[PDB]
Amino acid sequence: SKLIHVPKEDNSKEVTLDSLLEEGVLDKEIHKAITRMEFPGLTPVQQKTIKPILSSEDHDVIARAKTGTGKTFAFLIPIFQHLINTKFDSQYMVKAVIVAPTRDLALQIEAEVKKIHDMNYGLKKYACVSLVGGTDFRAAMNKMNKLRPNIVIATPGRLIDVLEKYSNKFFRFVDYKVLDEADRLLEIGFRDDLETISGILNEKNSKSADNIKTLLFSATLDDKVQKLANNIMNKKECLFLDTVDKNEPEAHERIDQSVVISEKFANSIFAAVEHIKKQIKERDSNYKAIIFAPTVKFTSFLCSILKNEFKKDLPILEFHGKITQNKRTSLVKRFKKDESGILVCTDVGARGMDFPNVHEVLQIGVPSELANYIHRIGRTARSGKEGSSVLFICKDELPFVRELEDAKNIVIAKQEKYEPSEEIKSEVLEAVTEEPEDISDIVISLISSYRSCIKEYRFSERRILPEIASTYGVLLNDPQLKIPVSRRFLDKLGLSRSPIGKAMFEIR
RNA sequence: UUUUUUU
Ligand SMILES: Nc1ncnc2c1ncn2[C@@H]1O[C@H](COP(=O)(O)OP(=O)(O)NP(=O)(O)O)[C@@H](O)[C@H]1O
Ligand SMILES: [Mg+2]
Secondary structure, three states, X not given: OEEEEXXXXXXXXXXXXXXXXXXXXXXXXXXXXXXXXXXXXXXXXXXXXXXXXXXOOOEEEEEEOOOOOOHHHHHHHHHHHHHHHOOOOOOOXXXXXEEOOOHHHHHHHHXXXXXXXXXXXXHOOOOEEEEOOOOOHHHHXXXXXXXXXXXXXXXXXXXXXXXXXXXXXXXXXXXXXXXXXXXXXXXXXXXXXXXXXXXXXXXXXXXXXXXXXXXXXXXXXXXXXXXXXXXOOOOOEEEEEEOOOOOOOOOOOOEEEEEEEEOOOOHHHHHHHHHHHHHHHHOOOOOXXXXXXXXXXXXXXXXXXXXXXXXXXXOEEEEOOOOOHHHHHHHHHHHHHOOOEEEEEOHHHOOOOOOOOOOEEEEEOOOOOOOHHHHHHOOOOOOOOOEEEEEEEEHHHHHHHHHHHHHHOOOOOEEEEEOOOHHHHHHHHHHOOOOHHXXXXXXXXXXXXXXXXXXXHOOOHHHHHHXXXXXXXXXXXXXXXXXXXXXXXXXXHOOOOOHHHHHXXXXX
């Protein structure tokens, strides 16, 4: 199917809620709901996508727009309009299915739908139910039955579960499917699930196998995504609506980016602690930040350090995939409203999450995929606000920074070195209450994580892996110490006859 | 159990 580009245009006639009302694109009832939110105007991606999504043409839509610029309402608005346009047809049936890569993002999109309901009660007849893992399955189905929603928001795993059992009852009249964070949902480990989802919806559809229109949204998207989505795009033509120049970097230009380079991976912990201390002092504790880490075990370790240093000054919140889902949801709600605090998380929080007035995004080590650099920093400087980001890495991670330049055109102007004083090392280390076995587990999680991105970030294995491993000795304040391990363990890893392996581990 | 993602 042919791709039709509509590139970023410089002198374009401004589209408004009023102009779309006058033109008959938007009904009064949705116009009213969005007007009462009192936004200055529609964001560029909203201006670009609303009419073409609702167009009577037989096309799919791909939309790219920078982090924090209103992609959610860019699809919710025309979805509501479609529901209004077809209000007498299949009114108890799901007409729009929106898929997201994390449960908390699916739940956020649902909350955005509820904000539309709150601004115009006449829209509550277009009901919405979220289908996400870690929630009571029966309770969500009671809700599907009671509310008979026209909009479903879901994560892939739970959506497949529901579809295998109830696709005939609720899903035979779907007209739109939305992949939010589309590039992520078409990576390995989501792509097959999206194909399963798309195949069921298409098979069960009462009109035809190609009825459903597909909408892809992300801040990080190109032509190569259309190829990946080939098996889920039904239509003969695909509009690529772009609000970013072809060569322009995808990172939001308002973010003040920097990188802090240490000699050792572990030193990035000390750099971050000293940075946060300074910010809490200089801002008089008026500090809201997000700090990203590579693994769940390390995230949790970092939280302990930051509670010991900073719990007297600011709340410290722990956010990753092993936090129970009830607590994930309650901490998201709190961090959205709070003026200050530090959210310490994995890439569970890299994409989509909208926490207002975050001042800074910090990163210890590299993200789980190159694109997530852009999404991580995009947690700040949202909806016209300012923001900064700091990447804390060691020397042996520098090829990541070069890869950002070569692959994504991101050049970080502010780069500086860091060397920890002996006093910061003593201060941080003394409060560490973890047993050596716990420290081994933590460092081992980092080894596995870094191993998996050696190729994509162009790391030198013989340097990055011994440096990560040496974190164990640093944290135990004895840099001669290697990680005690068994032969069978080393065999499983693949480093049993390697000098790299001998530099990292002691067969004990 | 290396980030998520039904159970
Ligand atoms: N027209 C508008 N004017 C001002 N703010 C808006 C407008 N539309 C949406 N917002 C707000 O902008 C914030 C971010 O919107 P959101 O839809 O989460 O951005 P996004 O493009 O999806 N970002 P990301 O998922 O990080 O790539 C939310 O708090 C919205 O309430
Ligand atoms: Mg979004």
